[PDB]
Protein backbone atom coordinates (compact mmCIF):
# COMPACT_ATOMS: atom_id res chain seq x y z
CA UNK A 1 0.00 0.00 0.00
CA UNK A 2 0.94 3.65 -0.34
CA UNK A 3 -0.82 6.75 0.86
CA UNK A 4 -1.69 9.16 -1.95
CA UNK A 5 -1.92 12.68 -0.60
CA UNK A 6 -2.58 15.95 -2.41
CA UNK A 7 -1.72 19.41 -1.10
CA UNK A 8 -4.07 22.15 -2.34
CA UNK A 9 -4.41 25.83 -1.49
CA UNK A 10 -4.27 29.28 -3.01
CA UNK A 11 -1.19 30.48 -4.86
CA UNK A 12 1.60 31.81 -2.68
CA UNK A 13 0.17 30.28 0.49
CA UNK A 14 3.06 27.89 1.08
CA UNK A 15 2.13 24.62 -0.62
CA UNK A 16 5.52 23.82 -2.15
CA UNK A 17 7.54 24.93 0.87
CA UNK A 18 5.34 22.99 3.29
CA UNK A 19 5.17 19.90 1.07
CA UNK A 20 8.89 19.65 0.44
CA UNK A 21 9.72 20.22 4.11
CA UNK A 22 7.05 17.71 5.22
CA UNK A 23 8.40 15.18 2.72
CA UNK A 24 12.02 15.76 3.83
CA UNK A 25 10.93 15.09 7.42
CA UNK A 26 9.20 11.88 6.26
CA UNK A 27 12.33 10.73 4.43
CA UNK A 28 14.38 11.58 7.53
CA UNK A 29 12.11 9.11 9.40
CA UNK A 30 12.82 6.37 6.86
CA UNK A 31 9.73 6.71 4.63
CA UNK A 32 10.03 6.35 0.86
CA UNK A 33 8.26 9.26 -0.84
CA UNK A 34 7.55 10.66 -4.31
CA UNK A 35 6.53 14.26 -5.03
CA UNK A 36 4.52 15.01 -8.18
CA UNK A 37 4.44 18.69 -9.06
CA UNK A 38 0.99 19.71 -10.39
CA UNK A 39 1.45 23.51 -10.47
CA UNK A 40 2.49 25.30 -13.70
CA UNK A 41 5.10 27.26 -11.73
CA UNK A 42 6.98 23.91 -11.75
CA UNK A 43 9.24 24.65 -8.76
CA UNK A 44 7.61 22.10 -6.43
CA UNK A 45 10.74 19.91 -6.24
CA UNK A 46 13.65 22.36 -6.32
CA UNK A 47 14.36 22.17 -2.57
CA UNK A 48 14.68 18.38 -2.71
CA UNK A 49 16.81 18.51 -5.90
CA UNK A 50 18.94 21.52 -4.80
CA UNK A 51 17.95 22.98 -8.15
CA UNK A 52 16.57 26.03 -9.90
CA UNK A 53 13.55 23.93 -10.80
CA UNK A 54 13.00 20.68 -12.70
CA UNK A 55 12.35 20.13 -16.40
CA UNK A 56 8.74 19.10 -16.89
CA UNK A 57 7.13 16.07 -18.50
CA UNK A 58 5.42 18.40 -20.98
CA UNK A 59 8.76 19.98 -21.94
CA UNK A 60 10.64 16.69 -22.14
CA UNK A 61 7.90 14.99 -24.19
CA UNK A 62 8.01 17.85 -26.70
CA UNK A 63 11.80 17.56 -27.09
CA UNK A 64 11.66 13.73 -27.39
CA UNK A 65 8.73 13.58 -29.84
CA UNK A 66 5.98 12.02 -27.74
CA UNK A 67 5.53 11.19 -24.09
CA UNK A 68 5.95 7.52 -25.05
CA UNK A 69 9.55 8.14 -26.09
CA UNK A 70 10.25 9.09 -22.47
CA UNK A 71 11.46 6.60 -19.89
CA UNK A 72 10.70 6.81 -16.19
CA UNK A 73 14.42 7.18 -15.36
CA UNK A 74 14.61 10.24 -17.62
CA UNK A 75 11.70 11.94 -15.86
CA UNK A 76 11.98 10.98 -12.17
CA UNK A 77 14.90 12.49 -10.26
CA UNK A 78 16.07 11.64 -6.74
CA UNK A 79 17.11 14.29 -4.22
CA UNK A 80 17.45 14.73 -0.47
CA UNK A 81 16.82 11.53 1.45
CA UNK A 82 16.19 9.63 -1.77
CA UNK A 83 12.88 11.46 -2.34
CA UNK A 84 11.75 10.99 -5.95
CA UNK A 85 10.62 14.08 -7.85
CA UNK A 86 8.74 14.85 -11.06
CA UNK A 87 7.06 17.95 -12.51
CA UNK A 88 4.00 17.93 -14.75
CA UNK A 89 4.41 21.25 -16.48
CA UNK A 90 1.72 23.03 -18.39
CA UNK A 91 1.16 25.02 -21.57
CA UNK A 92 2.39 28.58 -21.89
CA UNK A 93 0.03 31.31 -20.63
CA UNK A 94 -2.83 32.10 -22.99
CA UNK A 95 -2.50 28.74 -24.78
CA UNK A 96 -4.68 25.74 -24.01
CA UNK A 97 -5.74 24.62 -20.54
CA UNK A 98 -3.25 25.43 -17.78
CA UNK A 99 -3.94 22.06 -16.13
CA UNK A 100 -3.58 19.79 -19.16
CA UNK A 101 -0.03 18.73 -18.19
CA UNK A 102 -1.29 17.23 -14.93
CA UNK A 103 -3.40 14.68 -16.79
CA UNK A 104 -0.50 13.72 -19.05
CA UNK A 105 1.91 13.38 -16.14
CA UNK A 106 -0.19 11.29 -13.78
CA UNK A 107 -1.17 8.93 -16.59
CA UNK A 108 2.48 8.51 -17.65
CA UNK A 109 3.58 7.75 -14.09
CA UNK A 110 0.84 5.14 -13.62
CA UNK A 111 1.57 3.32 -16.90
CA UNK A 112 5.37 3.45 -16.50
CA UNK A 113 5.29 1.76 -13.10
CA UNK A 114 6.28 4.69 -10.88
CA UNK A 115 3.81 3.53 -8.19
CA UNK A 116 6.04 0.69 -7.08
CA UNK A 117 5.25 -1.06 -3.84
CA UNK A 118 7.71 0.10 -1.20
CA UNK A 119 6.79 3.72 -1.78
CA UNK A 120 5.07 4.78 1.43
CA UNK A 121 3.65 8.14 0.30
CA UNK A 122 3.02 10.08 -2.88
CA UNK A 123 2.35 13.80 -2.57
CA UNK A 124 0.76 15.86 -5.35
CA UNK A 125 1.41 19.63 -5.11
CA UNK A 126 -1.63 21.08 -6.89
CA UNK A 127 -2.64 24.61 -7.86
CA UNK A 128 -5.93 25.36 -6.06
CA UNK A 129 -7.01 28.81 -7.28
CA UNK A 130 -9.38 27.16 -9.75
CA UNK A 131 -10.65 23.60 -9.39
CA UNK A 132 -11.08 22.55 -13.00
CA UNK A 133 -9.29 20.79 -15.80
CA UNK A 134 -6.18 18.88 -14.77
CA UNK A 135 -6.19 20.58 -11.36
CA UNK A 136 -9.47 18.82 -10.53
CA UNK A 137 -8.27 15.53 -11.98
CA UNK A 138 -6.61 14.21 -8.77
CA UNK A 139 -10.03 14.56 -7.09
CA UNK A 140 -12.26 13.69 -10.06
CA UNK A 141 -10.27 10.60 -11.07
CA UNK A 142 -9.56 9.34 -7.55
CA UNK A 143 -5.77 9.84 -7.65
CA UNK A 144 -5.25 11.47 -4.24
CA UNK A 145 -7.38 9.91 -1.51
CA UNK A 146 -6.18 12.34 1.22
CA UNK A 147 -6.48 16.09 0.55
CA UNK A 148 -4.65 18.50 2.87
CA UNK A 149 -5.31 22.21 2.37
CA UNK A 150 -2.70 24.84 3.25
CA UNK A 151 -4.36 28.06 4.36
CA UNK A 152 -3.98 31.02 6.72
CA UNK A 153 -6.21 33.63 8.30
CA UNK A 154 -6.32 35.38 4.92
CA UNK A 155 -9.92 35.56 3.70
CA UNK A 156 -8.81 34.52 0.21
CA UNK A 157 -6.99 31.48 1.64
CA UNK A 158 -10.08 30.35 3.56
CA UNK A 159 -12.27 30.86 0.49
CA UNK A 160 -9.90 28.65 -1.49
CA UNK A 161 -10.14 25.97 1.21
CA UNK A 162 -13.93 26.14 1.01
CA UNK A 163 -13.85 25.92 -2.79
CA UNK A 164 -11.58 22.88 -2.75
CA UNK A 165 -13.94 21.33 -0.20
CA UNK A 166 -16.88 21.84 -2.59
CA UNK A 167 -14.95 19.94 -5.26
CA UNK A 168 -14.41 17.06 -2.86
CA UNK A 169 -18.14 16.95 -2.06
CA UNK A 170 -18.99 16.93 -5.77
CA UNK A 171 -17.10 13.67 -6.42
CA UNK A 172 -17.88 11.89 -3.15
CA UNK A 173 -20.28 9.46 -4.87
CA UNK A 174 -17.32 7.86 -6.70
CA UNK A 175 -13.80 6.92 -5.63
CA UNK A 176 -12.62 7.71 -2.12
CA UNK A 177 -11.21 11.24 -2.15
CA UNK A 178 -11.59 12.82 1.29
CA UNK A 179 -10.45 15.93 3.13
CA UNK A 180 -7.70 15.04 5.61
CA UNK A 181 -7.13 18.39 7.31
CA UNK A 182 -6.12 22.02 7.13
CA UNK A 183 -2.52 23.17 7.58
CA UNK A 184 -2.21 26.72 8.87
CA UNK A 185 0.77 28.57 7.35
CA UNK A 186 0.95 31.46 9.78
CA UNK A 187 0.86 35.12 8.78
CA UNK A 188 1.99 35.84 12.37
CA UNK A 189 -1.39 37.33 13.27
CA UNK A 190 -3.11 37.07 16.64
CA UNK A 191 -5.48 34.14 17.27
CA UNK A 192 -4.80 32.73 13.78
CA UNK A 193 -4.44 29.20 15.14
CA UNK A 194 -7.87 29.50 16.79
CA UNK A 195 -9.39 30.84 13.57
CA UNK A 196 -8.17 27.92 11.46
CA UNK A 197 -9.26 25.43 14.14
CA UNK A 198 -12.73 26.99 14.03
CA UNK A 199 -12.84 26.83 10.22
CA UNK A 200 -11.73 23.19 10.24
CA UNK A 201 -14.43 22.29 12.77
CA UNK A 202 -17.07 23.97 10.58
CA UNK A 203 -15.85 21.97 7.56
CA UNK A 204 -15.93 18.76 9.63
CA UNK A 205 -12.12 18.24 9.61
CA UNK A 206 -9.20 19.29 11.85
CA UNK A 207 -6.29 21.70 11.82
CA UNK A 208 -3.56 19.13 11.53
CA UNK A 209 -0.71 21.57 12.35
CA UNK A 210 0.08 25.27 12.78
CA UNK A 211 3.26 26.15 10.83
CA UNK A 212 4.93 29.31 12.23
CA UNK A 213 6.29 32.04 10.02
CA UNK A 214 10.07 31.67 10.29
CA UNK A 215 12.73 33.53 8.29
CA UNK A 216 14.90 30.39 8.36
CA UNK A 217 12.63 29.17 5.55
CA UNK A 218 13.90 31.98 3.29
CA UNK A 219 17.52 31.36 4.30
CA UNK A 220 17.14 27.67 3.45
CA UNK A 221 15.38 28.29 0.12
CA UNK A 222 17.99 30.84 -0.97
CA UNK A 223 20.35 27.87 -0.73
CA UNK A 224 17.85 25.57 -2.54
CA UNK A 225 17.25 23.44 0.55
CA UNK A 226 14.52 22.36 2.88
CA UNK A 227 14.90 23.56 6.46
CA UNK A 228 15.25 19.87 7.36
CA UNK A 229 18.46 19.65 5.31
CA UNK A 230 19.67 23.24 5.80
CA UNK A 231 19.49 23.32 9.63
CA UNK A 232 18.23 20.08 11.19
CA UNK A 233 18.40 21.71 14.66
CA UNK A 234 16.20 24.72 13.80
CA UNK A 235 12.97 25.31 15.70
CA UNK A 236 11.21 25.26 12.32
CA UNK A 237 12.65 21.85 11.44
CA UNK A 238 10.94 20.46 14.53
CA UNK A 239 7.70 22.08 13.37
CA UNK A 240 7.86 20.19 10.06
CA UNK A 241 8.73 17.01 11.95
CA UNK A 242 5.59 17.54 14.06
CA UNK A 243 3.48 18.02 10.92
CA UNK A 244 4.95 14.86 9.38
CA UNK A 245 4.20 12.86 12.52
CA UNK A 246 0.59 14.03 12.56
CA UNK A 247 0.12 13.33 8.83
CA UNK A 248 1.41 9.78 9.35
CA UNK A 249 -0.90 9.30 12.38
CA UNK A 250 -3.98 11.00 10.88
CA UNK A 251 -7.05 8.78 10.65
CA UNK A 252 -9.78 11.40 10.05
CA UNK A 253 -10.72 11.58 6.34
CA UNK A 254 -14.13 13.16 5.75
CA UNK A 255 -16.53 14.40 3.11
CA UNK A 256 -16.42 18.05 4.21
CA UNK A 257 -19.27 20.49 4.93
CA UNK A 258 -18.62 23.65 2.86
CA UNK A 259 -19.67 26.86 4.58
CA UNK A 260 -21.43 29.99 3.35
CA UNK A 261 -19.89 33.40 2.82
CA UNK A 262 -21.76 34.60 5.92
CA UNK A 263 -20.03 31.98 8.10
CA UNK A 264 -16.59 32.93 6.72
CA UNK A 265 -17.22 36.61 7.45
CA UNK A 266 -18.44 35.75 10.96
CA UNK A 267 -15.25 33.77 11.61
CA UNK A 268 -13.08 36.75 10.64
CA UNK A 269 -15.08 39.24 12.70
CA UNK A 270 -15.20 36.88 15.69
CA UNK A 271 -11.44 36.33 15.89
CA UNK A 272 -10.68 40.01 15.22
CA UNK B 273 -14.94 56.16 -27.42
CA UNK B 274 -14.46 54.32 -24.15
CA UNK B 275 -11.33 52.94 -22.56
CA UNK B 276 -11.52 49.20 -21.90
CA UNK B 277 -9.23 48.28 -19.03
CA UNK B 278 -8.63 44.93 -17.36
CA UNK B 279 -7.17 44.42 -13.89
CA UNK B 280 -5.23 41.15 -13.52
CA UNK B 281 -3.11 39.73 -10.71
CA UNK B 282 -2.84 36.79 -8.35
CA UNK B 283 -5.69 35.89 -6.01
CA UNK B 284 -5.85 37.89 -2.80
CA UNK B 285 -3.50 40.59 -4.09
CA UNK B 286 -6.08 43.38 -4.03
CA UNK B 287 -7.66 43.46 -7.49
CA UNK B 288 -11.28 43.98 -6.42
CA UNK B 289 -10.47 46.45 -3.65
CA UNK B 290 -8.18 48.51 -5.88
CA UNK B 291 -10.55 48.38 -8.87
CA UNK B 292 -13.65 49.42 -6.96
CA UNK B 293 -11.82 52.23 -5.17
CA UNK B 294 -10.19 53.40 -8.43
CA UNK B 295 -13.60 53.33 -10.14
CA UNK B 296 -15.26 55.22 -7.25
CA UNK B 297 -12.59 57.91 -7.58
CA UNK B 298 -13.25 58.07 -11.34
CA UNK B 299 -17.00 58.45 -10.76
CA UNK B 300 -16.26 61.13 -8.16
CA UNK B 301 -14.45 63.02 -10.97
CA UNK B 302 -17.50 62.79 -13.23
CA UNK B 303 -16.54 59.76 -15.35
CA UNK B 304 -19.15 57.18 -16.33
CA UNK B 305 -17.83 53.69 -15.58
CA UNK B 306 -18.91 50.05 -15.75
CA UNK B 307 -17.28 47.21 -13.78
CA UNK B 308 -17.48 43.67 -15.16
CA UNK B 309 -16.58 41.02 -12.60
CA UNK B 310 -14.57 38.18 -14.22
CA UNK B 311 -13.52 36.28 -11.07
CA UNK B 312 -15.54 33.26 -9.83
CA UNK B 313 -15.47 34.69 -6.30
CA UNK B 314 -18.05 37.14 -7.73
CA UNK B 315 -17.58 39.88 -5.10
CA UNK B 316 -15.97 42.40 -7.48
CA UNK B 317 -18.88 44.86 -7.22
CA UNK B 318 -20.07 44.59 -3.62
CA UNK B 319 -18.39 47.82 -2.46
CA UNK B 320 -20.11 49.83 -5.19
CA UNK B 321 -23.48 48.12 -4.56
CA UNK B 322 -23.21 48.16 -0.72
CA UNK B 323 -23.98 44.47 -0.99
CA UNK B 324 -22.93 41.01 0.10
CA UNK B 325 -22.11 40.30 -3.54
CA UNK B 326 -24.08 40.37 -6.79
CA UNK B 327 -26.05 37.60 -8.48
CA UNK B 328 -24.18 36.43 -11.55
CA UNK B 329 -25.14 36.20 -15.21
CA UNK B 330 -24.55 32.44 -15.04
CA UNK B 331 -26.91 32.11 -12.05
CA UNK B 332 -29.58 34.40 -13.48
CA UNK B 333 -29.51 32.71 -16.91
CA UNK B 334 -30.03 29.33 -15.25
CA UNK B 335 -33.05 30.59 -13.29
CA UNK B 336 -34.56 32.33 -16.36
CA UNK B 337 -34.03 29.45 -18.82
CA UNK B 338 -31.39 30.86 -21.17
CA UNK B 339 -29.19 33.92 -21.21
CA UNK B 340 -31.43 35.28 -23.99
CA UNK B 341 -34.36 35.49 -21.59
CA UNK B 342 -32.32 38.02 -19.60
CA UNK B 343 -32.56 41.75 -20.16
CA UNK B 344 -29.71 44.18 -19.58
CA UNK B 345 -31.70 46.00 -16.88
CA UNK B 346 -32.06 42.73 -14.95
CA UNK B 347 -28.31 42.09 -14.99
CA UNK B 348 -26.65 45.52 -14.69
CA UNK B 349 -26.99 47.27 -11.33
CA UNK B 350 -26.02 50.84 -10.45
CA UNK B 351 -24.26 51.75 -7.20
CA UNK B 352 -22.08 54.51 -5.78
CA UNK B 353 -21.66 57.42 -8.15
CA UNK B 354 -23.86 55.74 -10.74
CA UNK B 355 -21.19 53.10 -11.47
CA UNK B 356 -22.74 50.18 -13.36
CA UNK B 357 -21.94 46.67 -12.12
CA UNK B 358 -22.25 43.12 -13.42
CA UNK B 359 -20.78 39.75 -12.41
CA UNK B 360 -19.97 36.91 -14.80
CA UNK B 361 -20.07 33.99 -12.42
CA UNK B 362 -18.66 30.59 -13.13
CA UNK B 363 -19.43 26.90 -12.69
CA UNK B 364 -19.18 25.23 -9.31
CA UNK B 365 -15.73 23.87 -8.35
CA UNK B 366 -14.84 20.60 -10.03
CA UNK B 367 -17.40 21.13 -12.82
CA UNK B 368 -16.51 22.49 -16.24
CA UNK B 369 -14.09 25.33 -16.91
CA UNK B 370 -13.89 27.94 -14.14
CA UNK B 371 -13.66 30.72 -16.75
CA UNK B 372 -16.58 29.75 -18.97
CA UNK B 373 -18.90 32.36 -17.41
CA UNK B 374 -16.61 35.17 -18.55
CA UNK B 375 -17.19 34.32 -22.21
CA UNK B 376 -20.95 34.18 -21.73
CA UNK B 377 -21.03 37.48 -19.85
CA UNK B 378 -18.90 39.61 -22.15
CA UNK B 379 -20.78 38.34 -25.21
CA UNK B 380 -24.16 39.11 -23.58
CA UNK B 381 -23.06 42.64 -22.66
CA UNK B 382 -21.82 43.36 -26.19
CA UNK B 383 -24.99 42.09 -27.91
CA UNK B 384 -27.38 43.73 -25.43
CA UNK B 385 -25.91 47.20 -25.97
CA UNK B 386 -24.19 47.71 -22.62
CA UNK B 387 -21.25 49.46 -24.35
CA UNK B 388 -23.22 52.63 -24.92
CA UNK B 389 -21.35 55.74 -25.97
CA UNK B 390 -21.07 58.05 -22.98
CA UNK B 391 -19.42 55.36 -20.91
CA UNK B 392 -15.88 56.61 -20.38
CA UNK B 393 -14.31 53.44 -18.94
CA UNK B 394 -15.05 49.75 -18.58
CA UNK B 395 -13.01 47.77 -16.07
CA UNK B 396 -12.80 43.97 -16.11
CA UNK B 397 -11.71 42.40 -12.79
CA UNK B 398 -10.09 39.15 -13.93
CA UNK B 399 -8.65 36.17 -12.07
CA UNK B 400 -4.97 35.92 -13.05
CA UNK B 401 -3.66 32.77 -11.36
CA UNK B 402 -4.08 30.88 -14.63
CA UNK B 403 -4.28 32.56 -18.02
CA UNK B 404 -6.55 30.20 -19.94
CA UNK B 405 -10.15 29.66 -20.86
CA UNK B 406 -12.44 32.60 -20.20
CA UNK B 407 -9.75 34.31 -18.11
CA UNK B 408 -7.59 34.65 -21.23
CA UNK B 409 -10.53 35.73 -23.36
CA UNK B 410 -10.26 39.50 -22.61
CA UNK B 411 -6.70 39.32 -24.01
CA UNK B 412 -7.24 36.68 -26.72
CA UNK B 413 -10.40 38.28 -28.11
CA UNK B 414 -9.25 41.90 -27.81
CA UNK B 415 -11.80 42.97 -25.18
CA UNK B 416 -9.51 44.90 -22.82
CA UNK B 417 -6.95 47.02 -24.65
CA UNK B 418 -5.25 48.27 -21.43
CA UNK B 419 -4.05 45.66 -18.91
CA UNK B 420 -3.04 46.84 -15.42
CA UNK B 421 -1.50 44.25 -13.10
CA UNK B 422 -1.84 44.50 -9.32
CA UNK B 423 1.21 43.03 -7.60
CA UNK B 424 3.45 43.41 -4.55
CA UNK B 425 6.95 42.41 -3.54
CA UNK B 426 5.65 38.86 -3.06
CA UNK B 427 7.52 36.50 -5.38
CA UNK B 428 4.25 34.80 -6.32
CA UNK B 429 2.69 38.17 -7.22
CA UNK B 430 5.61 39.09 -9.49
CA UNK B 431 5.51 35.66 -11.13
CA UNK B 432 1.81 36.19 -11.86
CA UNK B 433 2.61 39.59 -13.41
CA UNK B 434 5.23 37.93 -15.62
CA UNK B 435 2.81 35.18 -16.63
CA UNK B 436 0.10 37.66 -17.58
CA UNK B 437 2.72 39.55 -19.58
CA UNK B 438 3.55 36.36 -21.52
CA UNK B 439 -0.12 36.05 -22.44
CA UNK B 440 -0.13 39.60 -23.74
CA UNK B 441 2.94 38.88 -25.88
CA UNK B 442 1.30 35.74 -27.29
CA UNK B 443 -1.64 37.67 -28.79
CA UNK B 444 0.22 40.82 -29.85
CA UNK B 445 -0.03 39.90 -33.55
CA UNK B 446 -3.81 40.45 -33.42
CA UNK B 447 -6.00 43.07 -31.76
CA UNK B 448 -4.43 45.77 -29.63
CA UNK B 449 -4.14 44.40 -26.09
CA UNK B 450 -1.21 46.06 -24.30
CA UNK B 451 0.26 46.24 -20.81
CA UNK B 452 -0.53 49.62 -19.25
CA UNK B 453 1.34 49.37 -15.96
CA UNK B 454 1.86 47.68 -12.62
CA UNK B 455 0.02 48.76 -9.46
CA UNK B 456 1.90 47.98 -6.27
CA UNK B 457 -0.43 46.95 -3.42
CA UNK B 458 1.97 47.34 -0.54
CA UNK B 459 2.80 44.62 1.96
CA UNK B 460 4.43 47.40 4.04
CA UNK B 461 7.91 46.04 3.36
CA UNK B 462 11.06 48.11 2.92
CA UNK B 463 12.02 49.26 -0.60
CA UNK B 464 8.92 47.59 -2.09
CA UNK B 465 8.17 50.62 -4.24
CA UNK B 466 11.70 50.46 -5.69
CA UNK B 467 11.33 46.72 -6.34
CA UNK B 468 8.11 47.10 -8.34
CA UNK B 469 9.57 50.07 -10.26
CA UNK B 470 12.54 47.86 -11.18
CA UNK B 471 10.26 45.00 -12.27
CA UNK B 472 8.14 47.36 -14.37
CA UNK B 473 11.24 48.75 -16.09
CA UNK B 474 12.40 45.21 -16.91
CA UNK B 475 8.98 44.41 -18.41
CA UNK B 476 9.09 47.66 -20.42
CA UNK B 477 6.19 49.34 -18.53
CA UNK B 478 5.87 51.58 -15.45
CA UNK B 479 4.69 51.37 -11.87
CA UNK B 480 1.63 53.52 -12.24
CA UNK B 481 1.01 53.92 -8.48
CA UNK B 482 2.09 52.59 -5.08
CA UNK B 483 -1.00 51.82 -2.95
CA UNK B 484 -0.16 51.84 0.79
CA UNK B 485 -1.44 49.21 3.18
CA UNK B 486 -4.08 51.02 5.23
CA UNK B 487 -6.48 49.50 7.78
CA UNK B 488 -9.13 52.01 6.71
CA UNK B 489 -9.68 49.67 3.76
CA UNK B 490 -10.89 46.94 6.13
CA UNK B 491 -13.07 49.38 8.07
CA UNK B 492 -14.69 50.54 4.83
CA UNK B 493 -15.22 47.01 3.46
CA UNK B 494 -16.76 45.81 6.72
CA UNK B 495 -19.40 48.44 5.93
CA UNK B 496 -19.57 47.35 2.24
CA UNK B 497 -18.09 50.61 0.98
CA UNK B 498 -15.15 51.94 -0.93
CA UNK B 499 -12.81 54.17 1.05
CA UNK B 500 -13.89 56.94 -1.34
CA UNK B 501 -17.48 56.69 -0.06
CA UNK B 502 -16.70 55.61 3.52
CA UNK B 503 -14.25 58.43 4.38
CA UNK B 504 -13.62 60.87 1.52
CA UNK B 505 -11.04 62.71 3.67
CA UNK B 506 -8.89 59.65 4.45
CA UNK B 507 -5.24 59.59 3.40
CA UNK B 508 -6.05 56.37 1.51
CA UNK B 509 -8.86 58.05 -0.44
CA UNK B 510 -6.32 60.50 -1.80
CA UNK B 511 -4.12 57.55 -2.79
CA UNK B 512 -6.93 56.08 -4.91
CA UNK B 513 -7.59 59.54 -6.37
CA UNK B 514 -3.91 59.70 -7.36
CA UNK B 515 -4.13 56.26 -9.00
CA UNK B 516 -7.27 57.30 -10.89
CA UNK B 517 -5.59 60.47 -12.13
CA UNK B 518 -2.57 58.54 -13.40
CA UNK B 519 -4.75 55.90 -15.10
CA UNK B 520 -6.67 58.65 -16.90
CA UNK B 521 -3.40 60.35 -17.95
CA UNK B 522 -1.49 57.17 -18.86
CA UNK B 523 -0.28 57.02 -22.46
CA UNK B 524 2.26 54.16 -22.24
CA UNK B 525 0.76 50.89 -23.54
CA UNK B 526 3.40 48.33 -24.52
CA UNK B 527 3.97 44.77 -25.65
CA UNK B 528 5.91 43.72 -22.53
CA UNK B 529 9.26 41.92 -22.22
CA UNK B 530 8.73 38.91 -19.90
CA UNK B 531 11.71 38.14 -17.68
CA UNK B 532 13.38 34.89 -16.64
CA UNK B 533 13.23 33.26 -13.23
CA UNK B 534 16.87 34.30 -12.72
CA UNK B 535 15.98 37.98 -13.16
CA UNK B 536 13.08 37.71 -10.69
CA UNK B 537 15.33 36.09 -8.09
CA UNK B 538 17.99 38.77 -8.66
CA UNK B 539 15.39 41.50 -8.09
CA UNK B 540 14.37 39.99 -4.74
CA UNK B 541 17.96 39.50 -3.56
CA UNK B 542 18.96 42.98 -4.73
CA UNK B 543 16.22 44.82 -2.84
CA UNK B 544 16.65 42.65 0.26
Ligand SMILES: Nc1ncnc2c1ncn2[C@@H]1O[C@H](COP(=O)(O)OP(=O)(O)O)[C@@H](O)[C@H]1O
Pocket residue numbers: 009010011012013014015016017018185186211212213214215217218221427428
Ligand atom coordinates in the same frame (compact mmCIF):
# COMPACT_ATOMS: atom_id res chain seq x y z
N1 LIG C 1 6.33 29.05 7.29
C1 LIG C 1 6.95 29.96 6.50
N2 LIG C 1 7.74 30.94 7.01
C2 LIG C 1 8.35 31.84 6.20
N3 LIG C 1 8.21 31.88 4.86
C3 LIG C 1 7.43 30.95 4.24
C4 LIG C 1 6.74 29.94 5.04
N4 LIG C 1 6.05 29.15 4.18
C5 LIG C 1 6.27 29.64 2.93
N5 LIG C 1 7.10 30.69 2.98
C6 LIG C 1 7.51 31.48 1.82
O1 LIG C 1 6.31 31.82 1.13
C7 LIG C 1 6.60 31.89 -0.27
C8 LIG C 1 5.57 31.09 -1.06
O2 LIG C 1 5.60 29.74 -0.62
P1 LIG C 1 5.39 28.55 -1.71
O3 LIG C 1 5.51 27.26 -0.94
O4 LIG C 1 6.21 28.77 -2.96
O5 LIG C 1 3.85 28.85 -2.09
P2 LIG C 1 2.89 28.07 -3.14
O6 LIG C 1 3.62 26.82 -3.58
O7 LIG C 1 1.63 27.80 -2.33
O8 LIG C 1 2.69 29.03 -4.30
C9 LIG C 1 8.00 31.35 -0.47
O9 LIG C 1 8.86 32.48 -0.57
C10 LIG C 1 8.31 30.66 0.82
O10 LIG C 1 9.70 30.77 1.11
Ligand SMILES: Nc1ncnc2c1ncn2[C@@H]1O[C@H](COP(=O)(O)OP(=O)(O)O)[C@@H](O)[C@H]1O
Pocket residue numbers: 155156281282283284285286287288289290457458483484485486487489490493
Ligand atom coordinates in the same frame (compact mmCIF):
# COMPACT_ATOMS: atom_id res chain seq x y z
N1 LIG D 1 -4.22 48.72 0.27
C1 LIG D 1 -4.79 47.87 1.16
N2 LIG D 1 -4.69 48.03 2.50
C2 LIG D 1 -5.27 47.17 3.36
N3 LIG D 1 -5.97 46.07 3.00
C3 LIG D 1 -6.13 45.80 1.68
C4 LIG D 1 -5.54 46.69 0.67
N4 LIG D 1 -5.86 46.19 -0.55
C5 LIG D 1 -6.58 45.06 -0.34
N5 LIG D 1 -6.75 44.85 0.98
C6 LIG D 1 -7.45 43.70 1.56
O1 LIG D 1 -6.88 42.55 0.93
C7 LIG D 1 -7.91 41.55 0.84
C8 LIG D 1 -7.95 40.99 -0.58
O2 LIG D 1 -8.21 42.05 -1.50
P1 LIG D 1 -9.16 41.77 -2.78
O3 LIG D 1 -9.26 43.08 -3.52
O4 LIG D 1 -10.41 41.00 -2.42
O5 LIG D 1 -8.19 40.75 -3.58
P2 LIG D 1 -8.43 40.00 -5.00
O6 LIG D 1 -9.68 40.60 -5.61
O7 LIG D 1 -7.16 40.29 -5.77
O8 LIG D 1 -8.63 38.53 -4.66
C9 LIG D 1 -9.22 42.20 1.21
O9 LIG D 1 -9.47 41.85 2.57
C10 LIG D 1 -8.92 43.67 1.18
O10 LIG D 1 -9.68 44.35 2.17
Ligand SMILES: [Mg+2]
Pocket residue numbers: 015016017039041043044125
Ligand atom coordinates in the same frame (compact mmCIF):
# COMPACT_ATOMS: atom_id res chain seq x y z
MG1 LIG E 1 4.30 26.03 -5.33
Ligand SMILES: [Mg+2]
Pocket residue numbers: 287288289311313315316397
Ligand atom coordinates in the same frame (compact mmCIF):
# COMPACT_ATOMS: atom_id res chain seq x y z
MG1 LIG F 1 -11.51 39.93 -6.21
